[model samples]
Target: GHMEGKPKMEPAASSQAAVEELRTQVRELRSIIETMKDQQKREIKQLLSELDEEKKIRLRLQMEVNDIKKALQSK
Candidate 1:
C-alpha cells in the first residue's frame, strides 16, 4: 500500500500501541458501564423487595406484642 511509506506495524510502536489500546479499552468500557448501570437498577429493586418483607415481619411482631399486652392486662 501507499503506506509502504509506512509499515504493517509501524516502528512507531509505542505511540501506535498506546492509541490502539485506548480504542479497544474505550469500546469495552462503555459496554461494561451500561451493563453495570442496569444491574444497579435491578439490584436496587431487588433490595427494596427484601426491605418490604422485613417491614411486614416487624408489623407482625408488633401485633403479637400488643395481643400479649392485652392478655396480661386482663389477668
Candidate 2:
C-alpha cells in the first residue's frame, strides 16, 4: 500500500481554525485507539505512525501560519 492517498492537507479559509480542527481530529484518533489496545496489534503500530505523520503536518502548518502572520506584519 502507498504511504499517502488522494488529495491531502488542503486548508480552507483560516489556517488558525484549520489547525484547531486538526488538533481535535488527532485527539479523537488517540481516543479511538485507546479502546483498540486489547485487540489491535500491528494495526496499532500503523495508526501510531499515521498519528505521528499527522503531527508533522500539523507542525508544518503551524509554521506556515506563523510565516503568514510575520509577512503580514512586516509588510
Candidate 3:
C-alpha cells in the first residue's frame, strides 16, 4: 500500500538545538554527581575520625572508672 502523505521530518536547526540542550544538561548533571560523590567521601572520612576520637575518650573514661572502683575497694 502507498502512503498518501510524507511524514514530516525534523528540521536540522531544531534537531541541533535539541542536541545542544541535552548535551548541556548532561554536562551539568555529571558535574553535580561528581561534586556530590566528593562531598560524600569527605563526610565519611570526617565521621570516621569523629568515631575514633569518641572511642578513645570512652576508653579513657572506662580506665578512670576502674581506677576509682579499685580505690574504693581498698578503702
Candidate 4:
C-alpha cells in the first residue's frame, strides 16, 4: 500500500543508483523501528504480569499477619 513518486522519462544509471540507495536506507530504518516497537510491547506485558504476582503475594502475607496478631492478642 506504499506509493512512490512517478518515474521520469529517462532513467540513467547514476539516478537509479541514487534512488536505490535512498530506498534501502529508508527500508532499514523502518525495520529497526518496527522491531523495537514490538519488543517494547512484549516487555510491557512481562512487567505487568510480574507486578500482579507481587501484589498477590503481598495480600496473602497481610492476611497471614492479621491472623497471627489475632491469635496472640486473644490468648
Candidate 5:
C-alpha cells in the first residue's frame, strides 16, 4: 500500500548490460534492506514513517551516476 500512490519509473536500462547491472543492484539493495529490516516497523505507533536515508542516498546517487554515464555515452 505504501507504493500505491507512487508513479512507476523503469530503471532506465537501455542495454542488456544495464539490465544485469540493475539485477546486481537489486541484490545489493536487498542486502541493505535485510541489514536494517527490524528498525523501521514503528510507523503505526509513531505516526512517522521510518525512511532509510542511507539506502535512499546510495540509490539516488547511483542512479544519478548511471544517468551521467548514459549521457556521456550518448555524447
Candidate 6:
C-alpha cells in the first residue's frame, strides 16, 4: 500500500457530500475490480485500497455527524 498523508479536514456538510460522492465512485470502482482481467487485478487492488480509504473517511464523517446529533439533543 502506498503510504499517503492523512486527508485534510473539510467543512462538515462538505465532508458529508464528499462521502456520498465517493460512495458512488467506490461502487463504480468495485464493478471495475470485479471484472478486471487477471493482468489488471493488481492495479484494481490499488484502486480498491484507495476506495477503502475513502470509506474510512466516510465512517469518520458519520461518527462526527453522530456526535453533532448528540450535542444538539442535549440542548
Number of the top TM-score candidate: 4
Put down candidate 4 lDDT per residue, 1-75, tens digits, no spaces.
Answer: 346446535555698788889999999999999999999999999999999999999999999999999999995
Expressed as tens digits, the lDDT of each residue in 1-75 for candidate 2 is 555646666556887987899899999999888877756776888899999999999999999899889989994
lDDT of 3 at 75: 50
lDDT of 1 by residue, 1-75 (tens): 352744365356488788888899999999999999999999999999999999999999999999999999995
**Which candidate gets the maximum lDDT versus the true structure?**
4
Model 5 over residues 8-42: C-alpha lDDT tens digits? 55555567887788799889998898767655655
Winner on lDDT between 2 and 6 is 2
In model 3, what is the error at residue 20, expressed in angstroms? 2.1
Q: Candidate 6 versus the native: TM-score?
A: 0.44
Candidate 6 least-lDDT 10 residues = 1-10
Candidate 3: which stretches are off by over 4 Å?
A: 1-12
Off by over 4 Å in 1: 1-24
Candidate 3 total steric clashes: 0
| Candidate 2, position 73, lDDT | 93
Q: What are the lDDT figures for the candidates, one per model?
A: 0.90, 0.85, 0.89, 0.91, 0.71, 0.83
Instruction: Name the weakest run of 10 consecutive residues (lDDT summed) in model 3.
Output: 1-10
Lowest summed lDDT over 10 consecutive residues: which window, candidate 5?
42-51
Off by over 4 Å in 4: 1-13
Model 6 residue 59 CA deviation (Å) reads 0.8
lDDT over C-alpha atoms for residue 20 of model 4: 85
